[PDB]
Amino acid sequence: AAKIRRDDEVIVLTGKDKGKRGKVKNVLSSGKVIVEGINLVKKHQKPVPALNQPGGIVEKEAAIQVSNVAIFNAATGKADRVGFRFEDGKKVRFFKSNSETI
Amino acid sequence: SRVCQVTGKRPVTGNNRSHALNATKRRFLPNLHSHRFWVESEKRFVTLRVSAKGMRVIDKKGIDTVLAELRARGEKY
Amino acid sequence: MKRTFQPSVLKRNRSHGFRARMATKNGRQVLARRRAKGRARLTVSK
Amino acid sequence: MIREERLLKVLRAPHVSEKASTAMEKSNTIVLKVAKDATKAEIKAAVQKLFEVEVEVVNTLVVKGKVKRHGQRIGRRSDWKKAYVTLKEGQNL
Amino acid sequence: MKAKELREKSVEELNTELLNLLREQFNLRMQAASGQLQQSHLLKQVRRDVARVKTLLNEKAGA
Amino acid sequence: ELDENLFLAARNLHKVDVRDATGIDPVSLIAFDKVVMTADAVKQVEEMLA
RNA sequence: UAAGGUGAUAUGAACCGUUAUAACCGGCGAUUUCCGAAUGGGGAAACCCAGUGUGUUUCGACACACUAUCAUUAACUGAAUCCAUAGGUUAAUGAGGCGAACCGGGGGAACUGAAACAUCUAAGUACCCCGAGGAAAAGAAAUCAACCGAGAUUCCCCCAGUAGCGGCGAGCGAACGGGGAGCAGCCCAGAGCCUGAAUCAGUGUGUGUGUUAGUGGAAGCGUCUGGAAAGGCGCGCGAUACAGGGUGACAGCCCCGUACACAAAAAUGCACAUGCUGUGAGCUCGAUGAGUAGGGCGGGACACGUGGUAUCCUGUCUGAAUAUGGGGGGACCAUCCUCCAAGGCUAAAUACUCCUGACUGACCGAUAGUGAACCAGUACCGUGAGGGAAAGGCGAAAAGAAC
Numbered sequence: 044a045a046k047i048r049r050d051d052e053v054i055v056l057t058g059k060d061k062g063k064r065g066k067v068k069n070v071l072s073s074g075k076v077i078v079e080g081i082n083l084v085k086k087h088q089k090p091v092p093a094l095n096q097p098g099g100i101v102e103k104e105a106a107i108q109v110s111n112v113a114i115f116n117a118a119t120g121k122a123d124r125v126g127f128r129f130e131d132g133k134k135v136r137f138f139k140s141n142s143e144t145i
Numbered sequence: 146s147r148v149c150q151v152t153g154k155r156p157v158t159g160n161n162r163s164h165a166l167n168a169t170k171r172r173f174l175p176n177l178h179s180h181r182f183w184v185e186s187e188k189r190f191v192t193l194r195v196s197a198k199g200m201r202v203i204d205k206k207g208i209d210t211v212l213a214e215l216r217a218r219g220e221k222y
Numbered sequence: 223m224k225r226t227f228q229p230s231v232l233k234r235n236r237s238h239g240f241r242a243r244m245a246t247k248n249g250r251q252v253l254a255r256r257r258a259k260g261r262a263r264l265t266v267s268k
Numbered sequence: 269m270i271r272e273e274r275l276l277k278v279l280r281a282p283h284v285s286e287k288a289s290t291a292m293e294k295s296n297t298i299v300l301k302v303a304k305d306a307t308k309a310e311i312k313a314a315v316q317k318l319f320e321v322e323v324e325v326v327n328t329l330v331v332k333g334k335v336k337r338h339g340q341r342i343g344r345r346s347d348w349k350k351a352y353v354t355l356k357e358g359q360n361l
Numbered sequence: 362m363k364a365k366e367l368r369e370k371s372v373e374e375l376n377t378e379l380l381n382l383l384r385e386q387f388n389l390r391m392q393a394a395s396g397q398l399q400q401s402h403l404l405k406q407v408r409r410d411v412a413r414v415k416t417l418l419n420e421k422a423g424a
Numbered sequence: 425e426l427d428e429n430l431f432l433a434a435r436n437l438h439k440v441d442v443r444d445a446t447g448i449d450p451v452s453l454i455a456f457d458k459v460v461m462t463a464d465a466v467k468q469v470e471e472m473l474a
Numbered sequence: 475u476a477a478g479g480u481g482a483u484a485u486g487a488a489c490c491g492u493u494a495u496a497a498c499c500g501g502c503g504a505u506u507u508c509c510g511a512a513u514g515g516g517g518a519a520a521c522c523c524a525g526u527g528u529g530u531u532u533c534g535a536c537a538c539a540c541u542a543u544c545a546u547u548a549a550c551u552g553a554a555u556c557c558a559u560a561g562g563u564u565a566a567u568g569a570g571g572c573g574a575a576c577c578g579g580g581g582g583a584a585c586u587g588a589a590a591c592a593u594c595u596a597a598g599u600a601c602c603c604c605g606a607g608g609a610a611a612a613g614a615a616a617u618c619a620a621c622c623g624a625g626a627u628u629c630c631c632c633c634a635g636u637a638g639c640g641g642c643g644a645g646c647g648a649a650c651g652g653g654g655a656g657c658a659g660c661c662c663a664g665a666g667c668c669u670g671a672a673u674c675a676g677u678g679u680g681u682g683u684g685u686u687a688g689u690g691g692a693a694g695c696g697u698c699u700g701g702a703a704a705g706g707c708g709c710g711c712g713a714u715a716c717a718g719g720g721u722g723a724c725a726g727c728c729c730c731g732u733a734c735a736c737a738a739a740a741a742u743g744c745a746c747a748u749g750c751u752g753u754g755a756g757c758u759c760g761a762u763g764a765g766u767a768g769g770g771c772g773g774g775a776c777a778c779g780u781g782g783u784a785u786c787c788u789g790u791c792u793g794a795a796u797a798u799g800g801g802g803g804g805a806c807c808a809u810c811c812u813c814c815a816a817g818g819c820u821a822a823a824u825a826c827u828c829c830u831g832a833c834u835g836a837c838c839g840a841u842a843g844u845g846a847a848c849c850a851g852u853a854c855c856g857u858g859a860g861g862g863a864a865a866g867g868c869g870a871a872a873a874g875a876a877c
Contacts, residue, residue, distance in 0.1 A: 082871095087876035126691090157773085205765060
């Protein structure tokens with residue numbers, strides 16, 4: 044079963060700035076997630092064909108690896124491993140850490 | 146082809162082996178002459194692939210038994 | 223000079239075209255060796 | 269009786285041509301696409317049943333397929349039928 | 362449209378092509394050239410369902 | 425000794441394997457440190473080496 | 475089975491949504507244009523052009539079903555010729571073409587080795603053609619043996635570089651017998667008694683055994699160094715799982731993978747039980763293997779160059795007996811032993827790897843390893859068959875061109 048997708052928030056493990064709940068703006072078929080309120084990239088972009096404009100940059104949020112981010116545990120402000128399909132009843136995520144959702 | 150069908154013979158390899166004893170080929174070929182018959186098993190006359198000293202076998206087996214064997218060998222008469 | 227090779231494809235098609243090879247025993251083997259090499263120019267000649 | 273309506277695989281989308289798209293495209297002549305398999309034998313009656321109008325003259329051609337695009341190895345247009353059709357009135361849905 | 366109808370006989374389902382879809386089947390040809398229909402569901406609904414009656418017409422010679 | 429179930433593992437712990445007295449190997453007697461051969465296995469091995 | 479998706483490069487309108495067939499994927503079906511086996515018939519490959527059968531005139535031939543060929547079997551039609559046959563036709567059954575290797579047959583070399591060359595050898599090998607099963611092929615004693623016994627075949631280790639052949643040279647090399655892997659046996663040359671019993675086959679179904687589409691699978695943090703930790707410090711947590719790929723420096727605790735546990739409406743390899751449908755066991759009395767065997771002439775193959783040449787085969791000659799009979803025991807004679815030819819089926823140990831699944835490297839790392847890790851059997855060379863290149867790894871991230 045696949046991890047992260049787009050509905051959950053992440054705590055971040057990769058070499059980017061940490062200490063905030065990364066909100067997933069979009070998910071990519073390249074194995075990456077785009078997270079809001081975490082990091083920025085400059086990008087000035089190609090100028091328009093006519094003719095004189097002011098200076099300005101795009102300043103947009105960065106994509107990071109979907110395999111080095113871990114989801115927020117909704118209990119102690121940290122990240123936790125979750126597990127798949129609980130041992131009793133309906134088909135649901137195991138939520139190993141405290142056995143509770145959201 | 147060089148096939149006689151009645152005695153089933155085929156050409157065979159063979160070496161010359163005559164003086165001055167060279168290892169050259171010579172071969173051996175059997176005979177085929179073909180012949181017309183009355184058989185009584187048919188209202189018509191028939192021609193069969195047969196050979197010299199091979200018609201001697203028809204006297205052993207009986208003409209209707211050779212007519213049936215050449216039929217089992219796919220012959221056209 | 224003339225390098226033994228004229229402009230005419232009718233002279234090629236009648237020997238090396240698909241119908242000129244697929245109908246002959248050895249030409250239908252050229253087509254099999256072409257396929258066995260992986261060569262895209264299977265017979266051309268048109 | 270006689271024929272079924274499967275004959276009516278006739279005429280495709282309009283295209284641009286200086287012979288039509290300048291002053292004639294809603295009053296005399298229009299340049300159309302044509303399917304890879306379609307009649308040239310009953311085309312005068314096929315339009316009379318599918319579009320319910322009459323055509324006086326129509327010729328079909330291909331000119332040439334271009335091959336020089338997106339190369340890499342160069343991509344082709346192929347031959348496909350185009351027709352110079354005298355429908356004299358416009359049709360859009 | 363169904364693709365299987367047990368003992369209901371397919372000889373009466375050819376009418377779906379020869380009369381009931383008639384004068385609307387493929388009608389966007391020549392009359393629309395933009396691709397801008399704004400009914401991207403309808404263009405998917407006028408596809409594949411007409412093939413299920415063709416899967417059912419496999420047994421049409423039965424009596 | 426050799427058990428009905430307990431004849432395999434530890435392995436992933438590194439420099440370890442579980443082994444019985446049948447075909448006792450000389451590498452197990454030098455390629456490691458203080459072997460856990462028992463006060464009864466020393467009697468079993470004497471009967472396998474004669 | 476999941477919320478992003480209508481393939482991708484490529485976005486987006488519109489719409490399906492985010493449960494009820496959004497999207498994707500597996501079993502087993504429906505299909506699969508035109509050229510190609512190619513198969514109505516024909517051509518300058520994808521084009522053109524016909525026939526029989528069914529239905530019909532809204533009215534210059536549609537639109538569905540079928541038509542190539544060999545043999546076998548079945549049914550039409552049909553001369554000289556009365557019957558008959560030859561000729562003219564249709565259809566089902568098996569084949570057809572493309573493979574990789576294994577496998578049965580047909581034709582069949584020469585460089586070479588003999589420091590040359592003719593016999594010998596290269597070799598029934600290559601090559602070209604054909605056939606055919608999942609294996610082929612082999613087999614159920616006229617076999618071997620040695621006066622004692624074995625009791626169908628196949629392969630492996632031996633027997634043995636021995637017995638032996640040979641310009642006696644170069645080469646070539648048994649057979650008996652032994653160790654092992656492995657081992658149900660059976661039908662015809664006809665027709666009775668009495669039955670459908672032995673032993674199978676096809677498909678269905680049940681059951682076992684294997685492989686499946688698919689789902690689950692244990693633990694960690696902060697601080698420090700730095701661009702950033704998987705490393706240091708503080709020490710904890712887990713392990714059938716610290717193989718492998720890694721990831722921003724060295725990860726068991728982040729991800730994928732691994733050791734492990736489950737699962738299949740249903741398919742399919744193997745083996746039994748069993749219904750249906752073909753098959754049909756025993757005993758008795760007949761029938762009992764003939765242009766064959768024995769033996770000449772000339773050769774081939776057998777280790778064996780015809781020799782003391784049996785054996786196996788036969789162009790050619792001669793040609794039986796058929797149980798006071800007949801083969802063999804490496805010429806021949808005798809005795810004795812040992813078998814009963816001239817008819818088929820057939821276990822398993824064995825061969826190979828297109829293919830499926832699991833998996834590995836004291837092997838190579840882009841002048842290597844395949845010619846090819848990449849729009850490479852492409853570019854390119856040649857009339858052509860055929861021959862055939864150059865080309866790999868930014869960074870954590872385009873953050874990559876505002877003004």
